[PDB]
Design an enzyme around this catalytic site. Sequence first.
Site, PDB file in Angstrom:
ATOM      1  N   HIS A  50      -0.274  -3.015  -3.542  1.00 23.28           N
ATOM      2  CA  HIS A  50      -1.656  -3.043  -5.214  1.00 23.28           C
ATOM      3  C   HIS A  50      -0.866  -3.097  -6.578  1.00 23.28           C
ATOM      4  O   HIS A  50      -0.604  -3.936  -7.775  1.00 23.28           O
ATOM      5  CB  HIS A  50      -2.072  -2.176  -4.808  1.00 23.28           C
ATOM      6  CG  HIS A  50      -3.307  -2.713  -3.965  1.00 23.28           C
ATOM      7  ND1 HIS A  50      -4.502  -1.454  -3.219  1.00 23.28           N
ATOM      8  CD2 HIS A  50      -3.640  -3.605  -2.899  1.00 23.28           C
ATOM      9  CE1 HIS A  50      -4.941  -1.862  -2.569  1.00 23.28           C
ATOM     10  NE2 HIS A  50      -4.312  -3.759  -2.117  1.00 23.28           N
ATOM     11  N   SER A  68       1.453  -9.228  -4.096  1.00 25.84           N
ATOM     12  CA  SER A  68       2.111  -9.821  -2.613  1.00 25.84           C
ATOM     13  C   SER A  68       2.518 -10.447  -2.374  1.00 25.84           C
ATOM     14  O   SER A  68       3.402 -10.980  -3.749  1.00 25.84           O
ATOM     15  CB  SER A  68       0.773 -10.053  -2.015  1.00 25.84           C
ATOM     16  OG  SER A  68      -0.220  -9.058  -1.534  1.00 25.84           O
ATOM     17  N   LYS A  99     -11.168 -13.232   7.820  1.00 23.98           N
ATOM     18  CA  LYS A  99      -9.595 -13.728   9.300  1.00 23.98           C
ATOM     19  C   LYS A  99      -9.344 -12.392   9.929  1.00 23.98           C
ATOM     20  O   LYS A  99      -8.952 -12.772  10.982  1.00 23.98           O
ATOM     21  CB  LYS A  99      -9.024 -13.705   7.457  1.00 23.98           C
ATOM     22  CG  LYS A  99      -7.330 -13.845   8.262  1.00 23.98           C
ATOM     23  CD  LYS A  99      -6.616 -14.359   7.184  1.00 23.98           C
ATOM     24  CE  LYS A  99      -5.292 -15.671   8.250  1.00 23.98           C
ATOM     25  NZ  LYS A  99      -4.721 -15.127   8.853  1.00 23.98           N
ATOM     26  N   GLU A 134       8.864   4.793  27.801  1.00 13.67           N
ATOM     27  CA  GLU A 134       8.747   3.902  27.572  1.00 13.67           C
ATOM     28  C   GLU A 134       9.348   2.358  26.955  1.00 13.67           C
ATOM     29  O   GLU A 134      10.268   2.861  26.464  1.00 13.67           O
ATOM     30  CB  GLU A 134       7.159   4.551  26.535  1.00 13.67           C
ATOM     31  CG  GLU A 134       5.983   3.558  26.849  1.00 13.67           C
ATOM     32  CD  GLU A 134       5.385   3.752  27.866  1.00 13.67           C
ATOM     33  OE1 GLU A 134       5.585   4.805  28.393  1.00 13.67           O
ATOM     34  OE2 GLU A 134       4.787   3.191  28.938  1.00 13.67           O
TER      35      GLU A 134
HETATM   36  C1  HEM Z   1       2.883   2.498   9.628  1.00 15.45           C
HETATM   37  C2  HEM Z   1       2.465   1.619   9.684  1.00 15.45           C
HETATM   38  C3  HEM Z   1       2.513   0.114   8.517  1.00 15.45           C
HETATM   39  C4  HEM Z   1       0.946  -0.287   8.094  1.00 15.45           C
HETATM   40  C5  HEM Z   1       0.322   0.594   8.868  1.00 15.45           C
HETATM   41  C6  HEM Z   1       0.814  -0.440   6.999  1.00 15.45           C
HETATM   42  C7  HEM Z   1       0.274  -1.351   6.422  1.00 15.45           C
HETATM   43  C8  HEM Z   1       0.494  -2.351   5.432  1.00 15.45           C
HETATM   44  C9  HEM Z   1      -0.736  -2.855   4.914  1.00 15.45           C
HETATM   45  C10 HEM Z   1      -2.162  -2.560   4.696  1.00 15.45           C
HETATM   46  C11 HEM Z   1       0.320  -4.125   4.090  1.00 15.45           C
HETATM   47  C12 HEM Z   1      -0.802  -5.486   3.075  1.00 15.45           C
HETATM   48  C13 HEM Z   1      -1.161  -6.404   3.523  1.00 15.45           C
HETATM   49  C14 HEM Z   1       0.080  -6.882   4.514  1.00 15.45           C
HETATM   50  O1  HEM Z   1       0.871  -7.429   4.446  1.00 15.45           O
HETATM   51  O2  HEM Z   1       0.218  -6.622   5.922  1.00 15.45           O
HETATM   52  C15 HEM Z   1       1.418  -3.840   4.670  1.00 15.45           C
HETATM   53  C16 HEM Z   1       2.453  -4.429   3.240  1.00 15.45           C
HETATM   54  C17 HEM Z   1       3.756  -4.697   3.818  1.00 15.45           C
HETATM   55  N1  HEM Z   1       4.423  -3.240   4.085  1.00 15.45           N
HETATM   56 FE1  HEM Z   1       3.609  -2.313   5.671  1.00 15.45          FE
HETATM   57  N2  HEM Z   1       2.829  -1.707   6.737  1.00 15.45           N
HETATM   58  C18 HEM Z   1       2.957  -0.257   7.677  1.00 15.45           C
HETATM   59  C19 HEM Z   1       4.449  -0.584   8.141  1.00 15.45           C
HETATM   60  C20 HEM Z   1       5.515  -1.041   7.512  1.00 15.45           C
HETATM   61  C21 HEM Z   1       6.788  -0.516   8.030  1.00 15.45           C
HETATM   62  C22 HEM Z   1       7.361  -0.136   8.596  1.00 15.45           C
HETATM   63  C23 HEM Z   1       7.897  -1.296   7.573  1.00 15.45           C
HETATM   64  C24 HEM Z   1       8.834  -1.980   7.081  1.00 15.45           C
HETATM   65  C25 HEM Z   1       9.161  -1.369   5.901  1.00 15.45           C
HETATM   66  C26 HEM Z   1       6.597  -1.931   6.194  1.00 15.45           C
HETATM   67  C27 HEM Z   1       6.894  -2.940   4.764  1.00 15.45           C
HETATM   68  C28 HEM Z   1       5.760  -4.326   4.625  1.00 15.45           C
HETATM   69  C29 HEM Z   1       5.674  -5.206   3.750  1.00 15.45           C
HETATM   70  C30 HEM Z   1       7.431  -4.994   3.134  1.00 15.45           C
HETATM   71  C31 HEM Z   1       4.376  -5.409   3.198  1.00 15.45           C
HETATM   72  C32 HEM Z   1       5.051  -6.400   2.297  1.00 15.45           C
HETATM   73  C33 HEM Z   1       4.278  -7.596   2.698  1.00 15.45           C
HETATM   74  C34 HEM Z   1       2.866  -8.197   2.231  1.00 15.45           C
HETATM   75  O3  HEM Z   1       2.615  -7.943   1.348  1.00 15.45           O
HETATM   76  O4  HEM Z   1       3.333  -9.971   1.286  1.00 15.45           O
HETATM   77  N3  HEM Z   1       5.202  -1.971   7.019  1.00 15.45           N
HETATM   78  N4  HEM Z   1       1.572  -2.995   5.093  1.00 15.45           N
END
Ligand code: HEM
Lengths: 55, 178, 378, 100, 73
Positions: free
Chosen positions: C200, C204, C226, C270
Amino acid sequence: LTARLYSLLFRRTSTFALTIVVGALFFERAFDQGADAIYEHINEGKLWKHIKHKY
Amino acid sequence: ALQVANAIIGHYDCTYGGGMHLSSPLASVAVTNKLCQSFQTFNICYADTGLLGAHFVCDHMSIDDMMFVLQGQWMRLCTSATESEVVRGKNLLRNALVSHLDGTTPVCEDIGRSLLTYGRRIPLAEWESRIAEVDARVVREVCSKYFYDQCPAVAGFGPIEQLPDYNRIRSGMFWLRF
Amino acid sequence: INIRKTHPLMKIVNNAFIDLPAPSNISSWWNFGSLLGICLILQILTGLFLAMHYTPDTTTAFSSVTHICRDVNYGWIIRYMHANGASMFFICLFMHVGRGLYYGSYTFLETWNIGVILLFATMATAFMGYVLPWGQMSFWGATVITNLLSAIPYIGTNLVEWIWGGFSVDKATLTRFFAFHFIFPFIIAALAMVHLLFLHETGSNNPTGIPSDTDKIPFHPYYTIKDILGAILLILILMLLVLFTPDLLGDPDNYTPANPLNTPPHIKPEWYFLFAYAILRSIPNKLGGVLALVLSILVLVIMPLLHTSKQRSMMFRPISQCMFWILVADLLTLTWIGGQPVEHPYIIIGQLASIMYFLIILVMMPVASIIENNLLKW
Amino acid sequence: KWLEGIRKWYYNAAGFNKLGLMRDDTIHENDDVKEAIRRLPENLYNDRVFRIKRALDLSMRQQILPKEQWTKYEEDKFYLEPYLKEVIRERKEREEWTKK
Amino acid sequence: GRQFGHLTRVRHVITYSLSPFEQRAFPHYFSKGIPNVLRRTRACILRVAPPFVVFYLVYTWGTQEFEKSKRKN
Ligand code: HEM
Ligand code: HEM
């Protein structure tokens, strides 16, 4: 045909809340009857009501 | 009936006298949080059609607030139209109608556009009668038909960067009683 | 004016859910954030009712889970929701990371770091969850990975003496692993909020790579419904899995009580740790394997530090796009190899695919980047 | 040269010929790109935001303008590259005077 | 990431937004949708498909070689 449905049910919010509750109970009764009937139809024979009748 | 309603809501400009004491709730709030430069909420009609309209000018960092309070007053007239506001709107309709029909050009303008459209001229006894005919029940009937979940036409011009998407106007256009 | 804009909670709700200016371009491959969130709190819920009906002791562990299978009303579906929801959770986590590596959101740095920490935490959390239900596979794989913690020089063996409570996997060790599986998803949720907080802050990313500040849209109610659509597709996959083949991802070798004298031959963790077991068993060393594992996830940390392109995505870089799909096939290849037992051609292509993986990353990616850089008249 | 035909086939196979974006549009932003975008005239700047806005809409609807409206390879009227390289050189000179 | 109002500056752009109650729910949902999705199908197999056939052949080749390495008793 549908304007009746919009005027009676889809103008006010309390009317819409009551009609989704009414649809919930109607769908409840109907879908449980349908699920029971179809599920015994695909399991005709080897179900424990049938053998219970034969006991 | 819409003349009564848009006599209640009506118009505001930044160059008036007395801002915190306006009877119009939209006008009091728009002075309070300093939202609009001006607005006009009004009617224009063509032959059995036309634009029941509203038009506000304000800075772009205050647009959604103005839109919110505008739709709030529209739905307030839609559901909780009580009597005193209807009385005040009928007084304002008397004043605007009589002081409008004055002079030479407004008089002859009235008669010309009357007898191109109607076939007749409306006398003032008809205006006093059709003022006396309409109360808050007629107001909530007309507001339940004309405003409450109808598809809008939005003309946006200038710094529209805050101005919300059309679906926000749709979803906030009615009330789910909040 | 409005309670949404001035109430001190509802300002946070307004800057969270209602008025996030998102790009108006993302396809369904960006759903997985909220999908992982709904999976996560569904995991918390299933595990909570589980731990209502579970006693953690090696006398009573498998009997207690058997009791959940028998006497708890819909207890068998609650247990299967927890297990296959964990499996769906790791599928969707790889989908989230595959997005973030493809479409170029890995230029965001601190969010990438906090994501990496979330990867470690989810691995350890679901791992100790797998230690809990007291199987043959549970006991022996956790024994192996306890010795994998013993693999490190000069600190590790006394550290494993310290985590044992003794000399082996004992009741104290079972209760340790119970409490850590019982407490780590809340730290996961907090760092998920921190992840979302940095995102935030920055803003994005689109599928294309161009920052879309001209064409933002309100987040509500387009992305709400969505992501509800994505949730319904997710839940029907989860439920068809728990209602039609529960023993698909479930294991044959799991359900005996933990016999410390058997050590079955077809041994496996697993499915989500198969590359964690193959890249482990590839290099003929204790130290070399465990260092290769931790260096693989530290390579995943490195993946932003070597972005030397001048576009953002891999979408407009076709050679690197083919390289990326080669990487997809290679990870799935080592997954299948880690599922397969140790035999000579599988030894061959496991060694080959592991060294192919590290060669793809440390050498091939910036070279492909500089070729794509050179070729557009730069 | 054969590599010129490689470039020809590449600019075919990239995709932003099909979208309607010139070469100075797909640039990943550091701060140098931010300065380079601000150091532009008004007509280039509005053409840039309009072509990006059409690219975002056509990528949302996932429908592509035909062969008849694509940027041909011999109409690569790149505009931002000298401005960007001059900001590169001035950033470099500031780098060097901070070095020594 | 901030409020709407200070994101960026764009002039001279008119957008005509259509109400959703004016248009059908699924216009040309097959009649354009199926040929254009087969078009995008054509646009992706020569990028993504060569790892598919590589894994396919390595899988069945490894299974055959595996049972052959069994059967050399
Ligand atoms: C614990 C599990 C995770 C959750 C619940 C999570 C949740 C989210 C959420 C809610 C967003 C904003 C909406 C979206 O882009 O899907 C996001 C964005 C992002 N996440 Fe995660 N994430 C997780 C794990 C990771 C991991 C392991 C990475 C890699 C290091 C990562 C990298 C990113 C990136 C680069 C974005 C920006 C993508 C964008 O909004 O264009 N996330 N994540
Ligand atoms: C704090 C919330 C959680 C609680 C209270 C919890 C509780 C439990 C309990 C009591 C068990 C042992 C019962 C059994 O599986 O037979 C278990 C197992 C397990 N948990 Fe959790 N859990 C939680 C969160 C998670 C999360 C977030 C995941 C990963 C998505 C997860 C994945 C697993 C797995 C894979 C097992 C082993 C399932 C099996 O093979 O039987 N748990 N959990």
